Amino acid sequence: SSLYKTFFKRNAVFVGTIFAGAFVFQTVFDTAITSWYENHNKGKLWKDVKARIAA
Amino acid sequence: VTDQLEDLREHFKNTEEGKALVHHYEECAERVKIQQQQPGYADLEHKEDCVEEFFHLQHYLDTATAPRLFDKLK
Amino acid sequence: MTAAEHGLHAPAYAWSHNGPFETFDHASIRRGYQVYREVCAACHSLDRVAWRTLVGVSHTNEEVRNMAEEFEYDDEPDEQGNPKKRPGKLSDYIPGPYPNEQAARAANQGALPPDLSLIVKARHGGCDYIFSLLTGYPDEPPAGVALPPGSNYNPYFPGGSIAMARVLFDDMVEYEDGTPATTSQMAKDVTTFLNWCAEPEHDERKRLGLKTVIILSSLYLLSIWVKKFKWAGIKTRKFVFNPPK
Amino acid sequence: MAFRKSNVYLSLVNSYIIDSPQPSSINYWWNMGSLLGLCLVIQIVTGIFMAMHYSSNIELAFSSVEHIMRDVHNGYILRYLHANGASFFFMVMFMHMAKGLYYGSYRSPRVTLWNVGVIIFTLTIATAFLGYCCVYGQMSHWGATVITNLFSAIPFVGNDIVSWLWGGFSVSNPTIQRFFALHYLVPFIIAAMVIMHLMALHIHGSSNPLGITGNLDRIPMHSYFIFKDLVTVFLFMLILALFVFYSPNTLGHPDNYIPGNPLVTPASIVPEWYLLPFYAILRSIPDKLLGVITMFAAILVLLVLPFTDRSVVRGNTFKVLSKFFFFIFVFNFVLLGQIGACHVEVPYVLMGQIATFIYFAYFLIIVPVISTIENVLFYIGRVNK
Amino acid sequence: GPPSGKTYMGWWGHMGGPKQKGITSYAVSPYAQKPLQGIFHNAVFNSFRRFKSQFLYVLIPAGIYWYWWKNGNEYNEFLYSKAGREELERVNV
Ligand code: HEC
Ligand code: HEC
Ligand code: HEC
Ligand SMILES: COc1c(O)c(C)c(C/C=C(\C)CC/C=C(\C)CC/C=C(/C)CC/C=C(\C)CC/C=C(\C)CCC=C(C)C)c(O)c1OC
Ligand SMILES: C/C=C(C)/C=C/C=C/[C@H](OC)[C@@H](C)[C@@H](OC)[C@@H](C)CCc1oc2c(O)c(OC)cc(OC)c2c(=O)c1C
């Protein structure tokens, strides 16, 4: 896979880059999961129930 | 409106299987009251009940009503 | 052991919260609270549930504040030391109907209505059991069953003789959202509400599980690959023997 | 020489985890030990963080745990990890022990290794019991009552030992407070025993599936087994995660979600699953004293195996009769557990009594008889005179 | 340091095995090997072999115990039903 040799060129990924990528992942991954989860449960959430309420 | 569970139960008590089960429960109930009106029922220590026959009925009804009841509820 | 002594096995209803990806249905929780307030609360405490936990779950911050204020709680003594009451706040716990155990037994033929905060987790069958119990009172006990005075028959309760009579009847509650208040509907709602009381972390717990399981699965598949790579030289290693002269 | 070898602290790490010569052929069954160390760590870490929010007073214990469940951020995760982790700790320990049984790991020169392991097992059972009592649910109270009463079977002073353990007339405040203090202590004694266990392991090294010497072909712990351990560590975490997040109460008892009541013992009382086979053994003896003696003997009999295994080869890999009876033993153990979960009723009582016999007969009769027969079979099948 | 007791395992260079002579080993860098994907077509039918020789040692004892369990269970069910209350009084006490 030449896609690897463009970014890291035959060398292993260094801890600094690993740590940095981890912070990014944490945020991205969380939003992706929360989104899917809330969508999959559309109609049941409190957000949805509050929309059909007015007091 | 009318209770959704009672509806599905009544409906199932009237299928072939349901009738057969209420029959057996009924045949048990009959046999029981006949034993109560006889002398010495208080001191018998061998009184028969129809829980078993009742449970078979209820079990059948549960098995048929349980997977459908919620599609009718909100 | 006899079927009567064990109790009838509760069947599996299709709860909307069953399933790894499913949250509670919050409208049902909202309704369940009403059924609890208007029917159950007369005999059942709910000691472990604080008003504040309702906010953002089934009611608004405003609605809960109004509900809490309808109850008086002991306050700190005044400047002179005499006791004084106070309306409820969000930090308070939902009050119970009786002041002590003895007063609760007196109002129920000597029986003690358990607290319902954990009832869903404190019984085999969970929601299926609670629901079935509430909707399982026959108009008449099976033939031959000698039911003690003050007792009631219910096939789902162990031994069949339960001290709580049927309390749910069609349209005894007027749902704020217009839903037809049938007995099975009300049972379905309180039960959903009681599951939340016992497992308030439910929705969030499953969301975290989803992330945890995805990361761990990947790490597992990945480690297998890394291990095979690190072992390739050993696994394919070859030996030859040439006996010494 | 390399620093990892010259430094006083690092050399310990090097000799035990980096350069430690391992037999090239050990299989995944040899990954259980690291999984046990990991379990020990999970129990200690989660318990200390929970201790920070726990009250041992009998009036507050149950509510303090509900407080951890409801008010402590991520509290339910800590409690569910701790509870489910205790169960996972036993599943893995049984596998670690079963592995030992099958491969003749208890044999010379690893007898000391095996004996220390038996002590750890007893300590682990005691630690989990102490923790279970801390919740102070219905199962906690009666479990504490029944188990402290085991000592009343001791002639003369038994009831005195019990009142001393209780700190009073019955399981009360003094009891739960001392059980929490002891629950906190034992895990550290287990940690010290694990070190003694690893020390005995280090002098002779691990055994292997062939049952023969590993001296002709060793490979370093570092890299090979460090990464091979990683594979099972993740699989272990994945499964533990499925329970913690998706089915946190499946391995427990619903009665422990009811505060303990000194005047009522639930008809539904059942011991924790990992204690069922032992419970069944005790229940099978219709005598108080003998019931408790036989149950304890079911654990101590593990010490007899190095002497009753008469074979001249280590392990069951190339032994047809021994493999068969080993599995009779395993499934008989599962049966004992299924009997423990049942009512003291007709078919069950007799089945439990027979399974109990089979349990002891395995160590005292089957193994010595069968291993002797296999010895002879191996001989006459090749000697032509 | 203090004298150490003789064991059955040494360390690199003095493992305690017998003197080896005549055996020659060969190996190839994992780097030079075909990346993990070849464990199929060649390593699939070959697999499942270390359980075709063992399943009987596991299955037979399992079968014996499952049957024994099923039997006692079904017998208990009969004893506590109406049909068996007569036999129950007999086998009980
Ligand atoms: C007082 C008149 C009651 C009302 C109103 C409701 N309950 Fe009740 N409940 C009551 C008693 C006296 C008992 C004791 C039963 C016994 O035999 O000991 C109970 C018990 C329960 C239980 C526990 C059953 C069990 O498995 O042990 C449950 C799950 C329960 N009650 C639920 C419940 C709900 C949800 C109610 C409103 C819909 C309700 N109860 C009303 C007395 C009374
Ligand atoms: C204080 C440190 C601490 C240590 C060290 C610790 N625990 Fe606990 N443990 C607790 C506390 C606090 C509780 C009560 C909270 C709870 O119920 O989980 C508890 C409860 C338990 C329970 C009851 C679980 C339940 O159902 O709630 C078990 C079983 C248990 N521990 C097992 C262990 C084992 C096994 C170890 C050691 C290998 C261990 N514990 C080490 C503090 C500790
Ligand atoms: C009653 C038996 C027994 C118990 C319990 C026991 N061990 Fe062991 N352990 C052994 C034996 C025997 C071996 C040697 C196995 C071999 O090499 O064949 C061993 C080996 C090990 C190994 C090496 C790797 C392996 O899995 O073989 C480690 C690490 C280890 N044990 C850790 C632990 C820890 C940690 C605990 C408990 C908290 C524990 N053991 C409990 C018997 C036991
Ligand atoms: C010859 O064969 C071997 C072999 O020898 C070895 C070593 C291994 C590898 C396995 C191990 C070394 C397992 C070892 C495990 C232990 C020694 C466990 C020790 C346990 C502990 C619990 C340590 C104590 C920890 C604490 C006190 C920390 C917790 C407290 C904290 C973080 C404080 C928190 C507070 C605040 C305020 C932040 C093998 O796998 C193996 O076979 C292949
Ligand atoms: C201060 C420290 C003390 C006092 C330590 C004591 C340690 C004792 C033993 O460990 C070494 C002991 C736990 C161990 O016996 C070998 C177990 C197999 C005991 C198994 C056991 O469990 C039960 C249980 O869990 C219950 O729960 C609801 C209820 C029980 O009856 C109904 C039992 C029971 O009848 C038995 C035998």
Q: What is the dihedral of CA C183, C185, C189, C190, to 10 degrees?
A: 10
Structure tokens at C72: 């008086």
Per DSSP, the three-state class of E12 is coil
Alpha-carbon distance of C81 to C77, in angstroms, equals 5
Strand residues in chain E grouped as ranges (E) = 23-26
Q: Residue D355 contacts by C-beta under 8 Å, 6 or more apart in sequence?
A: D280, D284, D332, D335, D336, D339
Count Cα neighbours of B32 within 13 Å in the Cβ-side half-sphere. 17
**Whether residue C156 is found in the same domain as residue C232:** no
Structure tokens at D319: 């032994």
Residue of B nearest to C168 (CA): B3
Cβ contacts (< 8 Å) between E17 and chain D: which residues?
213, 215-216
| Number of neighbours of residue D265 by Cβ within 10 angstroms | 14
Counting atoms of ligand 3 from 1, which one is nearest the CA of D114? 12
- Maximum C-alpha span of chain D: 80
As a three-state string, the secondary structure of chain D is CCHHHHCCCHHHHHHHHHCCEEECCCCHHHHHHHHHHHHHHHHHHHHHHHHCCCCCCCCCHHHHHHHHHHCCCCHHHHHHHHHHHHHHHHHHHHHHHHHHHHHCCCCCCCHHHHHHHHHHHHHHHHHHHHHHHHCCEHHHHHHHHHHHHHHHHCCCCHHHHHHHHHCCCCCCHHHHHHHHHHHHHHHHHHHHHHHHHHHHHHHHCCCCCCCCCCCCCEEEHHHHHHHHHHHHHHHHHHHHHHHHHHCCCCCCCHHHHCECCCCCCCCCCCCCHHHHHHHHHHHCCCCHHHHHHHHHHHHHHHHHHHHHCCCCCCCCCCCHHHHHHHHHHHHHHHHHHHHHCCCCCHHHHHHHHHHHHHHHHHHHHHHHHHHHHHHHHHHHCCCCC
* Selection from D247, D234, D227 nearest residue D38 by Cα: D234
Deposited experimental method? X-ray
Per DSSP, the three-state class of C8 is coil
Q: Residue B2 contacts by C-beta under 8 Å, 6 or more apart in sequence?
A: C170, C182
Tally of domains in chain D: 1
Q: Is the dihedral of CA E86, E87, E92, E93 positive or negative?
A: positive
Per the CB < 8 Å rule, is C155 touching B54?
yes
Alpha-carbon distance of E57 to D364, in angstroms, equals 21
**Is ligand 2 within 6 A of the CB of residue D51?**
yes
Amino acid type, D50: M
Cβ contacts (< 8 Å) between B25 and chain E: which residues?
none
DSSP state of E3: -
**Whether residue C54 is found in the same domain as residue C142:** yes
Tally of domains in chain C: 2
Q: Residue C185 contacts by C-beta under 8 Å, 6 or more apart in sequence?
A: B4, B73, B74, C179
Asked whether A and D share 3 or more beta-carbon pairs under 8 angstroms, the answer is no
How far is CA D155 from its chain centroid?
29
Per DSSP, the three-state class of B24 is helix
Radius of gyration of the CA atoms of chain A, in A: 20
- Could you tell me which residues are beta bridge partners of residue D259? D137
**Whether residue C225 is found in the same domain as residue C104:** no
* Selection from D300, D299, D306 nearest residue D104 by Cα: D306
* D204, D225, D227, D232: residue to mutate for ligand 4 pocket, most atoms within 8 A of CB: D225
The answer to whether C175 faces chain B, any CB pair under 8 Å, is no
Does residue D327 contact residue E62 with C-beta atoms inside 8 Å? Answer: yes
Cα D174–C46–D176 angle (5° rounding)?
A: 10
For residue D138, what are the CA distances in angstroms to B21, C122, D37, D182, D263? 40, 10, 31, 20, 11
The phi, psi pair for D234, rounded to 5°, reads: -70, -40
How many residues are present in chain B?
Answer: 74
Can you give the CATH number for the domain in which E92 is found? 1.20.5.210
Does residue C73 contact residue C95 with C-beta atoms inside 8 Å? Answer: yes
Q: Residue E5 contacts by C-beta under 8 Å, 6 or more apart in sequence?
A: D203
Q: Residue C225 contacts by C-beta under 8 Å, 6 or more apart in sequence?
A: E36
Alpha-carbon distance of C222 to C231, in angstroms, equals 14
Ligand nearest to the CA of D315: 3
**Whether residue C127 is found in the same domain as residue C235:** no
| Number of neighbours of residue E5 by Cβ within 10 angstroms | 5
Q: How far is the CA of D122 from the centre of ligand 5 (A)?
A: 11
Alpha-carbon distance of D95 to D101, in angstroms, equals 10
How far is CA D179 from its chain centroid?
20
Q: In what helix (H) or strand (E) does residue B58 lie, and over which residues does it extend?
A: helix B51-65
* Selection from D158, D205, D184, D153 nearest residue D15 by Cα: D205
The reply to whether C127 sits in an annotated binding site is: no
Cβ contacts (< 8 Å) between B48 and chain E: which residues?
82
Alpha-carbon distance of D257 to C116, in angstroms, equals 11
Per the CB < 8 Å rule, is C143 touching B5?
no
The answer to whether C221 faces chain E, any CB pair under 8 Å, is no
**Whether residue C205 is found in the same domain as residue C191:** no
Q: Is the dihedral of CA C36, C39, C45, C50 positive or negative?
A: positive
**Whether residue C43 is found in the same domain as residue C162:** yes
Per the CB < 8 Å rule, is C207 touching A44?
no
Cβ contacts (< 8 Å) between C3 and chain E: which residues?
80-81
Ligand nearest to the CA of D100: 3
Per the CB < 8 Å rule, is C237 touching E25?
yes
The answer to whether C121 faces chain D, any CB pair under 8 Å, is yes
Q: Residue C99 contacts by C-beta under 8 Å, 6 or more apart in sequence?
A: none
Q: How far is the CA of D37 from the centre of ligand 4 (A)?
A: 5
Q: Residue D172 contacts by C-beta under 8 Å, 6 or more apart in sequence?
A: D58, D166
- Nearest protein CA to atom 29 of ligand 1, as residue: C130
Ligand nearest to the CA of D50: 2
User: Which residues of D are annotated as catalytic?
Assistant: 202, 206, 228-229, 272
* Cβ-defined contacts of E13-19 (< 8 Å, 24+): E15/D21, E15/D215, E15/D216, E15/D218, E16/D215, E17/D213, E17/D215, E17/D216, E18/D216
Tally of domains in chain E: 1
Can you give the CATH number for the domain in which D371 is found? 1.20.810.10
Q: How far is the CA of C108 from the centre of ligand 1 (A)?
A: 10
Cα D362–D368–D371 angle (5° rounding)?
A: 105
Alpha-carbon distance of C140 to C135, in angstroms, equals 14
DSSP state of C51: G
Task: Assign domain B1-74 one CATH number from 3.40.47.10, 3.40.50.9100, 3.40.1160.10, 1.10.287.20.
Answer: 1.10.287.20
Alpha-carbon distance of B12 to B16, in angstroms, equals 9
Cβ contacts (< 8 Å) between C200 and chain D: which residues?
70
DSSP state of C113: P
Q: Residue C216 contacts by C-beta under 8 Å, 6 or more apart in sequence?
A: D234, D237, D238, D241
**Whether residue C96 is found in the same domain as residue C81:** yes
Does residue C90 contact residue C67 with C-beta atoms inside 8 Å? Answer: no
Per the CB < 8 Å rule, is A34 touching C24?
no
**Whether residue C189 is found in the same domain as residue C205:** no
For residue D133, what are the CA distances in angstroms to D123, D138, D227, D287? 16, 9, 38, 26
Task: Domain of residue C208: give its range.
Answer: 201-245
**Is ligand 1 within 6 A of the CB of residue C29?**
no
Written as one string, the DSSP assignment of C118-174 is STTTSSTTHHHHHHHHHT---SSPPTT--PPTT-EE-TTSTTSEESS-----TTSS-
For chain E, list residues whose CB is within 8 angstroms of any CB belonging to chain C: 21-30, 33, 35-36, 39, 80-81
Residue of D nearest to E90 (CA): D346
Radius of gyration of the CA atoms of chain C, in A: 27
Q: Is the dihedral of CA D41, D43, D48, D50 positive or negative?
A: positive
Counting atoms of ligand 3 from 1, which one is nearest the CA of D39? 38
Query: Between C24, C60, C177, which is nearest A44 by CB?
Result: C24
Does residue D215 contact residue E16 with C-beta atoms inside 8 Å? Answer: yes
Alpha-carbon distance of C193 to D319, in angstroms, equals 59
Task: Domain of residue E15: give its range.
Answer: 1-93
The answer to whether C22 faces chain A, any CB pair under 8 Å, is yes
DSSP state of C204: H
* Selection from C234, C217, A16, B13 nearest residue D236 by Cα: C217
Structure tokens at C214: 């995805």
Q: How far is the CA of D36 from the centre of ligand 3 (A)?
A: 8
Structure tokens at C221: 């598949």
DSSP state of A13: P
Does residue D281 contact residue D356 with C-beta atoms inside 8 Å? Answer: yes
* Selection from C124, C110, C134 nearest residue C187 by Cα: C134
Structure tokens at D141: 């109270």
* Selection from D8, D14, D36, D157 nearest residue D94 by Cα: D36
The answer to whether C112 faces chain D, any CB pair under 8 Å, is no
Alpha-carbon distance of D118 to D124, in angstroms, equals 10
Q: How far is the CA of C113 from the centre of ligand 1 (A)?
A: 5
Q: What is the dihedral of CA C53, C54, C55, C59, to 10 degrees?
A: 180
For residue D176, what are the CA distances in angstroms to D49, D188, D259, D272? 19, 20, 13, 19
The structure was resolved to a resolution in Å of 2.3
Does residue D36 contact residue D233 with C-beta atoms inside 8 Å? Answer: no
Domain locations in chain B as residue ranges: 1-74
| Number of neighbours of residue D345 by Cβ within 10 angstroms | 14
Alpha-carbon distance of D77 to D85, in angstroms, equals 11
Q: Which domains does chain A have, with CATH numbers?
A: 1-55 (1.20.5.260)
The reply to whether C197 sits in an annotated binding site is: no
Please give the interface size between A and C, counted as residue pairs whose CB atoms are below 8 Å apart: 41
Structure tokens at D169: 């007339």
Cβ contacts (< 8 Å) between B13 and chain C: which residues?
none
* Selection from C10, C22, C35, C7 nearest residue C197 by Cα: C35
